[PDB]
Design a protein around this ligand. Structure first.
Ligand SMILES: *[C@@H]1O[C@H](CO)[C@@H](O)[C@H](O)[C@H]1NC(C)=O
Ligand SMILES: *[C@@H]1O[C@H](CO)[C@@H](O)[C@H](O)[C@H]1NC(C)=O
Lengths: 106, 106
């Protein structure tokens, strides 16, 4: 039995934030179902989170969701090196994703 | 206490295979410890596996390991669109990774 793919309800909300403040990036998914939402950093090619699990060893990354639709990654105490592109990816076949950015102003 | 990072014992052996055969890529890691090995398709940064869990919906992907040292991703019944670069990634900080290539000949 085939099920619908999840669909993104809105584009990724980007964030601009000063060094040392906390940053958030949010992905809004409709009809997630049995699929999973993963955050990745695109510059560094690094897996950050999958569902409610932080994969990276970086202790400043957190992840939370409400109703499996709004998925918000937290980057605690941001440094200048956190500036870059971040992907919200769903494990459909083919894979679907959208990208946002965190800008760290100096 | 700090622990060692895992280290790759050898490069990933590439593989060339004809359409319809099974293919394998192997990543050999030393001192994995509490860290995790993930396989990704580099073209799109599609998360394929994490540890012994297949993340992608693609039912032709499999993962196995022996003693948390040798990590082997299998691609069953390969197609031309399986040709490309694959990354073996460890969730250290900073992230560590090796890449291999699956060439599919028609
Ligand atoms: C975030 O930035 C990208 C390009 O910089 C843009 O396409 C996207 O729509 C932005 N997000 C929002 C919510 O506007
Ligand atoms: C794998 O392939 C790449 C290019 O296809 C090559 O440069 C590299 O040396 C190969 N790795 C090994 C271990 O042979």
């Amino acid at each position: 039995s085939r099920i619908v793919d999840p669909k993104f309800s809105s584009p990724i909300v980007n964030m601009t934030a000063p060094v040392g403040r906390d940053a958030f990036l949010t992905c809004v998914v409709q009809d997630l179902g049995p699929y999973k939402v993963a955050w990745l950093r695109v510059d560094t090619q690094t897996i950050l989170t999958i569902q409610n699990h932080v994969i990276t060893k970086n202790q400043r990354i957190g992840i939370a969701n409400s109703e499996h639709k709004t998925w918000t990654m937290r980057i605690k105490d941001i440094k200048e090196s956190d500036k870059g592109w971040y992907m919200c990816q769903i494990n459909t076949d083919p894979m679907k994703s959208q990208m946002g950015y965190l800008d760290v102003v100096v």
